[PDB]
Design brief:
The structure is cut from a larger assembly and holds 4 copies of chain A. By secondary structure, chain A is an alpha+beta fold. The first copy, chain A, is built from 2 helices and 2 strands. The longest helix of chain A is centred in the first third of the chain and has 4 residues. Chain A is rod-shaped. Chains in contact: A-B, B-C, B-D. β1 of chain A pairs antiparallel with β6 of chain B. Bound molecules: a molecule of 2 linked components (NAG-NAG) (7 copies) and 2-acetamido-2-deoxy-beta-D-glucopyranose (3 copies). The site of a molecule of 2 linked components (NAG-NAG) has 2 residues of chain D, from β11. A molecule of 2 linked components (NAG-NAG) binds next to loops of chain D. Chain C: This is Spike protein S2'. The PDB classes it as viral protein. Keywords: SARS-CoV-2, Spike protein, viral protein. The entry is titled "Cryo-EM structure of SARS-CoV-2 S-Delta variant (B.1.617.2) in complex with Angiotensin-converting enzyme 2 (ACE2) ectodomain, three ACE2-bound form conformation 1". Chains A, B, C, D: Spike glycoprotein.
C-alpha cells in the first residue's frame, strides 16, 4: 500500500494494490488413437532384394 | 561371387535408401503424435487436437452432433471440446482471477489491515492467517463478522462495509 | 399492458452490452500480421522475426 | 465391352427454380440458439437450376447435385480435365456393398456404362495414387454438394423421404459434411454414370457462387433457417 501510494503514511480507506491469478500446474496433450502404420515390415524383412 | 568365407569386405550387404518428397499436395504421412492422460478440476493448459488454451476442465452435458469437434458460445470463444479418444464433451472454464484490495484504519491509528480478493470464491485463496469470510463482493481475510449494524465507514460492497473497534 | 415504455434504461443497457461485445470481438483481427494467436507465431517463427 | 448405344433418347435440357435448397454446415463448430453470419460459396435462393432427363458438364468452382429416384440407377461420378491418361482423374463408384474412390489416369470409354455380366468404362488404368473404400452412399431425394479447394475434395450429402410428384419441394434441410479427401487435382469438368441394363433419367445440377448468408442455430446445434443477404432489400 505504501509503495503504490508512494507515501510513508496512509489515510483511512480502501486501496487497490495488485492482481491475483491462479497458475497452471501441468500440461495436457491429447490426440486420436494411433493406427494405420506405414508398412515398413514388408520392406526391411523382404526375403529377396 | 559371395562365399561364406570372404572377410568383411566381400560380404553381401542389404541397402535401403529412404528419400522424402514434399510436393505441393497436402502431406499424407507423419510421425506418431503421442498423448498423455486426462485430468479434471485443475487449472492446466491443453493442446486438444491442435486447439491450445488454458483453463479448468469439467464434465458437461451438451449434445454435439456426431461430426462437431468443439463449440463456442458467442464472440468466438471456445467453451466445449470433444476428446479424440473417449469421445465425450468436456467444458472449459477460465482459471479464477481478480484484483486485491487492502482495508486499513489509517497509519495514524494502527497498522493492522485486512485483505479482500474481488470476485474470487473462498476455495483457492493462496495463505490462511486469521478468520476468513465469504461475501457477495469476494473473499475477506483479517476481519471479524458481527451481527450488529452501524453507519458505514469504509464501503466494501454488496451493502456491507468494515470499521475499526480490531477490524 | 403496454410495453416499450422503459426505452431509456433498455437503450443504456443495450449500448453498454454492444460496446463490450465489439471490444471483445476486436480480439480476432490480424492487423496486417500473419495470424491472430500469439502461440502460433511464437511456435512458428524465430523470436527476432 | 466398350460399345456405343445412341446419341439421344429424350433430350429435355430444361430449367427450374431452386427455391431454398442447397445449405450445408460450413465447419465443425457447435452453436446453440444463435444467429451467425458467414461468407462462403453457396447456391443462391430462387436460382435457375438445370434439369436433365448426358454430356460432360463443366464444374466451375463447386456443384450442387440433386436426384429424386427409386432403384438408384445413377451409380457414381467422374472428374478431371482431359478425361484421359495424360492427366490425373477421379472416379467414384458404388455397389451394393461399398463405395469406392480412385485417383488414377484412366482411359474412359466415350460412352461410359457399367452393366453386369466393376469395369467396362475405362479401357486402361495405371499410375494409381489414391484408393478409398467405405460404406455405400445410397421416391427418395438425394442431395450432394461437391467442392474442391486447397488440394482438398469435400463432399456433403443428405437423403430425404418425399412424395412430391415433379420437382424440388418447398422445404428446408441442411447438408451434413460427409467426406474430405487430401488429393491435389485440377477438376474442371465432370460426368455422371448410369448402370442401365441392356434395353435418360431426371437429375438437377446447379452451380455455386461466393456470397454471405445468415444461419439460425437451435438449441441442439441444427440449422433451421437461413437468409440470403443479397436477394432483396428486406434480406439486406
Ligand atoms: C523384422 O522381423 C524381426 C523379427 O521379428 C523384427 O524384430 C523384432 O522387433 C520386435 C519389435 O517390433 C522386437 O520386440 C523383437 O525383439 C525383434 N526381434 C528381433 C529378432 O530383432 C523386426 O522389427 C522386423 N522388421 C520390421 C521393419 O518390422
Ligand atoms: C482408442 O483405443 C482404446 C483402447 O482400446 C479404446 O478404448 C476402449 O474402447 C472400447 C469400446 O467400447 C471399450 O469397450 C474399452 O473398455 C475401452 N478401453 C479402455 C477404456 O481402456 C477407445 O475406444 C479407442 N477410441 C477410438 C477407437 O476412437
Ligand atoms: C465456492 O465453491 C464451493 C465448492 O464448489 C461451492 O460449494 C458448492 O455449492 C453448490 C451450490 O450451493 C453445491 O451444489 C455444491 O455441492 C457445493 N460444493 C461443495 C464442495 O460444498 C460454493 O458455493 C462456492 N461459493 C459460492 C459463493 O458460490
Ligand atoms: C463391390 O465393389 C468392391 C470394390 O472392390 C468389390 O471388390 C471387393 O471389395 C471387398 C472390400 O474391400 C474385398 O474384401 C473383396 O475382396 C473385393 N472383391 C474382389 C474380387 O477383390 C466387390 O466384389 C463388389 N461387390 C459386389 C457385390 O458387387
Ligand atoms: C505418375 O504418378 C507420379 C506420382 O504422382 C507422377 O510424378 C509426379 O507428378 C507430379 C504431377 O505433375 C509432378 O508435379 C511431380 O514432379 C512428379 N514427380 C516425379 C518424381 O515424377 C507422374 O508424373 C505420373 N505420370 C507418369 C507418366 O509417371
Ligand atoms: C493445376 O493448374 C494450375 C494452373 O492451371 C497449375 O499451375 C501451374 O504450375 C506450373 C508448375 O508448377 C507452373 O509452371 C505454371 O505457371 C502454373 N500455372 C499457373 C496459371 O499458375 C498446376 O500445376 C496444376 N496442378 C496439377 C496437379 O495439375
Ligand atoms: C433437442 O434435444 C432435446 C434434448 O434431448 C430434445 O428433447 C427430447 O426430445 C425427445 C424426443 O421427442 C423426448 O423424448 C425427450 O423427452 C425430450 N427431452 C426433454 C428434456 O424435453 C429435443 O426434442 C431436441 N429437438 C428440439 C427441436 O428441441
Ligand atoms: C494522529 O493525528 C493526530 C491529529 O491529526 C495527531 O495529534 C497525532 O499525533 C497523530 N498520531 C500519529 C501520527 O501517530
Ligand atoms: C450471529 O452471528 C453468528 C456468527 O457470526 C451467526 O451464526 C448467527 O446466525 C447470527 N445471529 C444470531 C441471532 O445469532
Ligand atoms: C431460367 O432462365 C430462363 C431463360 O434462360 C427463364 O425463361 C426462366 O424463367 C428462368 N427460371 C427461373 C429464373 O427460375
Amino acid at each position: 500500500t505504501k509503495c503504490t501510494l508512494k507515501s510513508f503514511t496512509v489515510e483511512k480507506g480502501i486501496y487497490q494494490t495488485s492482481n491475483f491469478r491462479v497458475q497452471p500446474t501441468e500440461s495436457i496433450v491429447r490426440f486420436p488413437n494411433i493406427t494405420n502404420l506405414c508398412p515398413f515390415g514388408e520392406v526391411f524383412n523382404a526375403t529377396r532384394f | 561371387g559371395f562365399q561364406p568365407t570372404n572377410g568383411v569386405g566381400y560380404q553381401p550387404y542389404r541397402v535401403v535408401v529412404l528419400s522424402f518428397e514434399l510436393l505441393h499436395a497436402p502431406a499424407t504421412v507423419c510421425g506418431p503424435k503421442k498423448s498423455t492422460n486426462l485430468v479434471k478440476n485443475k487449472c492446466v493448459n491443453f493442446n486438444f487436437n491442435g486447439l491450445t488454451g488454458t483453463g479448468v476442465l469439467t464434465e458437461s452435458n451438451k449434445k454435439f452432433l456426431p461430426f462437431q469437434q468443439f463449440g463456442r458460445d458467442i464472440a468466438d470463444t471456445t467453451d466445449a471440446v470433444r476428446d479424440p479418444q473417449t469421445l465425450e464433451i468436456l467444458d472449459i472454464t477460465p482459471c479464477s482471477f481478480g484484483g486485491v484490495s487492502v482495508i486499513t484504519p489509517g497509519t495514524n491509528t494502527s497498522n493492522q489491515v485486512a485483505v479482500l480478493y474481488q470476485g474470487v470464491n473462498c476455495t483457492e485463496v493462496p495463505s490462511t492467517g486469521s478468520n476468513v469470510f465469504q461475501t457477495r463482493a469476494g473473499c475477506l481475510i483479517g476481519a471479524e463478522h458481527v451481527n450488529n449494524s452501524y453507519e458505514c465507514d469504509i464501503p466494501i460492497g454488496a451493502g456491507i462495509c468494515a470499521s475499526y473497534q480490531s477490524i | 399492458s403496454t410495453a416499450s415504455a422503459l426505452g431509456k434504461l433498455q437503450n443504456v443497457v443495450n449500448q453498454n452490452a454492444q460496446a463490450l461485445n465489439t471490444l471483445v470481438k476486436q480480439l480476432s483481427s490480424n492487423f496486417g500480421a500473419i495470424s491472430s494467436v500469439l502461440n502460433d507465431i511464437l511456435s512458428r517463427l524465430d523470436p527476432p522475426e | 465391352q466398350c460399345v456405343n448405344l445412341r446419341t439421344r433418347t429424350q433430350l429435355p435440357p430444361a430449367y427450374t427454380n431452386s427455391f431454398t435448397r442447397g445449405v450445408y454446415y460450413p465447419d465443425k463448430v457447435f452453436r446453440s440458439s444463435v444467429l451467425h453470419s458467414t461468407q462462403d460459396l453457396f447456391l443462391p435462393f430462387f436460382s435457375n437450376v438445370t434439369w436433365f432427363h448426358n454430356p460432360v458438364l463443366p464444374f466451375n468452382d463447386g456443384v450442387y447435385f440433386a436426384s429424386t429416384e427409386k432403384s438408384n440407377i445413377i451409380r457414381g461420378w467422374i472428374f478431371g480435365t482431359t478425361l484421359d491418361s495424360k492427366t490425373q482423374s477421379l472416379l467414384i463408384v458404388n455397389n451394393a456393398t461399398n463405395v469406392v474412390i480412385k485417383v488414377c489416369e484412366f482411359q474412359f470409354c466415350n460412352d461410359p456404362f457399367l452393366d453386369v455380366y466393376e469395369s467396362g468404362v475405362y479401357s486402361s488404368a495405371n499410375n494409381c495414387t489414391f484408393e478409398y473404400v467405405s460404406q455405400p452412399f445410397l421416391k427418395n431425394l438425394r442431395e450432394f454438394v461437391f467442392k474442391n479447394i486447397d488440394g482438398y475434395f469435400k463432399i456433403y450429402s443428405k437423403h430425404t423421404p418425399i412424395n412430391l410428384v415433379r420437382d424440388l419441394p418447398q422445404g428446408f434441410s441442411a447438408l451434413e459434411p460427409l467426406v474430405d479427401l487430401p488429393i491435389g487435382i485440377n477438376i474442371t469438368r465432370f460426368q455422371t454414370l448410369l448402370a442401365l441394363h441392356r434395353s435418360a433419367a431426371a437429375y438437377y445440377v446447379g452451380y455455386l457462387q461466393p456470397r454471405t448468408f445468415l444461419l439460425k442455430y437451435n438449441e441442439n446445434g441444427t440449422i433451421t433457417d437461413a437468409v440470403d443477404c443479397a436477394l432483396d432489400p428486406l434480406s439486406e
